[PDB]
């Protein structure tokens, strides 16, 4: 008769407070340090990847971002760390970060034509192109907004309105063109003193252009500060401008409002399927804790910065 | 002789890491699950339980909030979660969230009349009424501020400087009327291009009306955007205007400056006395932990989002 225990052919080790590198018998490692290194689907939904493109490049459709004209239902948006085709004409979309926040809860857009090109009878919708936004070696401009140059040497006040009779919210995009001098204004827009006045139930906005001498970004000394709103059902947007108006052409009806994220990752898209996606790669594991990265869309393990977490479920 | 332990014919249970339900002897519960379920006093001070109203409906005195024209000392302010009587005339208020934040440290106002109606020789004070702010069916407008329209076919410039001779900080409110078109500036006032210049030792404002079209909110299209300041003792507030001036007539003097909160709940007012208030029901207990709600005003238990939080202060 005896009292005792067993060991095994085990080399795995745990750490305690009072002693480190302690051998264990049949322990469970809760830290997943392995990833496939590729981007795959999330629960069978193909994500919206952006190759040298941005949210400002996609929503205001860049001519070099024409891969995303008709986007199906996604689950997260992948962007690269420094995308080259991002506001090819200089400027800054106002509340760009808040807009990227509001695209972290949207899984699908329907790009609808709320304002066609035929709905500008008194303005020029064809010459609004630039060499800073090229396409196939030719001048071009964004495809989801029209740069309205004067027609017949005249730019009247626009006073366009759109009532949202659709039962979903609409994301409406426009902008103001900050030129360099008054000569460029008089060349493009017949009225010297211009404004844009946006009115709806909640949002009130007046935009007087800031005509100033500026340096060269992307080849031209001009800026187009873009703006956005969300128009509710049975709510009407009212744009009024006698100049410098980058008018909307397409809107993005929000039909699937759920959960998503923006990853900012430069990983090539693989072809597999799993539940948890990380910017570096994918996890297909039911471990409690992952050290791979902080941001993990979907049902995932919890981020712990440590490199070795082995709960000792063994004698020694 | 023998050795052993007590048993007490009890069924109460405690939680351990390695086992979930263990029968226990003399366990002391630390979690206060229960509450009386109604709002009442803190140390004898009747709270400011404004009903179907908001902070902006109270400070700018809504015609539908008439019960609080002279508010006694309060320990906290309660507003319902979705109030209806608030900004009856469509509008907004800049730093409204900061105004609620600074009101959360104020326990008493003394409503003083800083500007009388006799201090408007050349401006109408009785025609400033609205149909979107009803009072016994008839049109009305906020009591505290007067929406000065022209008198005698013109709007003489309003150069009024008020000196704070009191020994307390004064909360002073005013606003600007962003009209919906220029014909209402021709009719309500006289000058088309108007400004509101507000000067303080620590504040500069040059508000201008945004005169474009907006949609219907509450039956009307104009937007009154309100503003506030806090004036120090021996500090002077200076108002200069030639139009769109929502001029002050009443101001609030900060007499007691302590601890309060802007609580959001719709529970009716009950009659009790306690030390802590939680929005769904007042806690009258000395336990270390409560699950009732995160926001609690007074000497209260710490909030822990859990169930069955009981320490085993006994054996078994």
């Amino acid at each position, epitope marked *: 008769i005896c009292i005792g225990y067993h060991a095994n052919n085990s080399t795995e080790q745990v750490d305690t407070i009072m002693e480190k590198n302690v051998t264990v018998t049949h322990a469970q490692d809760i830290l997943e340090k392995t990833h496939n290194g590729k981007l795959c689907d999330l629960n069978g939904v193909k994500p919206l990847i952006l190759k040298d493109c941005s949210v400002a490049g996609w929503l205001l459709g860049n001519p070099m971002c024409d891969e995303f004209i008709r986007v199906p239902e996604w689950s997260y948006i992948v962007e690269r760390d420094n995308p080259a085709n991002d506001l090819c004409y200089p400027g800054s979309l106002n509340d760009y970060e808040e807009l990227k926040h509001l695209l972290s809860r949207i899984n699908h857009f329907e790009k609808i034509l709320i304002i066609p090109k*035929s709905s500008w009878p*008194n303005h020029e919708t064809s010459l609004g192109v630039s060499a800073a936004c090229p396409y196939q070696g030719a001048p071009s401009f964004f495809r989801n907004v029209v740069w309205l140059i004067k027609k017949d040497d005249a730019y*009247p006040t626009i*006073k366009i309105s759109y*009532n*949202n009779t659709n039962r979903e919210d609409l994301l409406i995009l426009w902008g103001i063109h900050h030129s360099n001098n008054a000569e460029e204004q008089t060349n493009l827009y017949k009225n010297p003193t211009t404004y844009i006045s946006v009115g709806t139930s909640t949002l009130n906005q007046r935009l007087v252009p800031k005509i100033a001498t500026r340096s060269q970004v992307n080849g031209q000394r001009g800026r187009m500060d873009f703006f956005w709103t969300i128009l509710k059902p049975d709510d009407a947007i*009212h744009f009024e401008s006698n100049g410098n108006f980058i008018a909307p052409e397409y809107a993005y009806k929000i039909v699937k409002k759920g959960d998503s994220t923006i990853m900012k990752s430069g990983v090539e898209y693989g072809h597999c399927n799993t539940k948890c996606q990380t910017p570096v790669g994918a996890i297909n594991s039911s471990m409690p804790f992952h050290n791979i990265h902080p941001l993990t869309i979907g049902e995932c393990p919890k981020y712990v910065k440590s490199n070795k977490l082995v709960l000792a479920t063994g004698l020694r | 002789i023998c050795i052993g332990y007590h048993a007490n014919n009890s069924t109460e249970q405690v939680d351990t890491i390695m086992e979930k339900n263990v029968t226990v002897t003399h366990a002391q519960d630390i979690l206060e699950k229960t509450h009386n379920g109604k709002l009442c006093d803190l140390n004898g001070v009747k709270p400011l339980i404004l009903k179907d109203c908001s902070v902006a409906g109270w400070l700018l005195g809504n015609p539908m909030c008439d019960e609080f024209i002279r508010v006694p000392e309060w320990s906290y302010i309660v507003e319902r979660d979705n109030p209806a009587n608030d900004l009856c005339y469509p509008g907004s208020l800049n730093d409204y969230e900061e105004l609620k934040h600074l009101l959360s440290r104020i326990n008493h106002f003394e409503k003083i009349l800083i500007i009388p109606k006799s201090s408007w020789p050349n401006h109408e004070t009785s025609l400033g009424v609205s149909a979107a702010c009803p009072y016994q069916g008839a049109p009305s407008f906020f009591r505290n501020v007067v929406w000065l329209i022209k008198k005698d076919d013109a709007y003489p410039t309003i150069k009024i400087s008020y000196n704070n001779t009191n020994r307390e900080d004064l909360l002073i409110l005013w606003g600007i009327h962003h009209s919906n078109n*220029a014909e209402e500036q021709t009719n309500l006032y006289k000058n088309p291009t108007t400004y509101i210049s507000v000067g303080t030792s620590t504040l500069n404002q040059r508000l201008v009306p945004k005169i474009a079209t907006r949609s219907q909110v509450n039956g009307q299209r104009g937007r009154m955007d309100f503003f506030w300041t806090i004036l120090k003792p021996d500090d002077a507030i200076h108002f200069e205007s030639n139009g769109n001036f929502i001029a002050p007539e009443y101001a609030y003097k900060i007499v007691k400056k302590g601890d309060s909160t802007i609580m959001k709940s719709g529970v009716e007012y009950g009659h009790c006395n306690t030390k802590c208030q939680t929005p769904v029901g007042a806690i009258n207990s000395s336990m270390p932990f409560h699950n009732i709600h995160p926001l609690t005003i007074g000497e209260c238990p710490k909030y822990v989002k859990s169930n069955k939080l009981v320490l085993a202060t006994g054996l078994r």
Partner: antibody
Amino acid sequence: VQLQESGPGLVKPSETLSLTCTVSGGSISSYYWSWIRQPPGKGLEWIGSIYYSGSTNYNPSLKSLSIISVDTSKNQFSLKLNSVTAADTAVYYCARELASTGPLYYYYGMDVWGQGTTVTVS
Amino acid sequence: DIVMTQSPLSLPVTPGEPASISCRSSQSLLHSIGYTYLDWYLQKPGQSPKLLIYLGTDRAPGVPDRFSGSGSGTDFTLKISRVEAEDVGVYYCMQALQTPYTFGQGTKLEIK
């Protein structure tokens, strides 16, 4: 974009006038196409308005078997006024209303007006 | 239906002096959007109607800035500051609010 009204020039009371207007130098799409009558010295009267897809709107004040007609393939819209009774003598105008009365509520007016046409009903 | 009335019928105006043409009718001539729906049409003798000021107080392409308009609700006002001998016509005022569009009586302008 210009509009050219082609007219009969006279009609006896029993029959229906055949007054067409053809869009030359432009497109028929995405604009309201409306007929406006002008009797001699009695102002201007709006006969009707046809959106290209459909949704014909007549004038309640007078009903004269109005059949405003539209055809895109030929870039043409046409007017017929049967049951005429010699009160319809008019220097008719076709006009291109530049407005949308649906979700897009832009209204820019009747910019383009035809050269005109004359009809003295006898 | 909506019936308008020209308050002036003929305006002998010295060139270089602003004029005033006004018309009104029953309803408030403001659609759900809120942009006052009115137009003024010149209809020069021999020519055809031209938009001039539209949607209440906004000017057409090509028309010089001497034309302007104002008003909301029932009351309206056309005004041609520094009028010129090119500006002859009738200035019909059309209510564009509802389906049965109607016109004014016309203001035939004679050069003084």
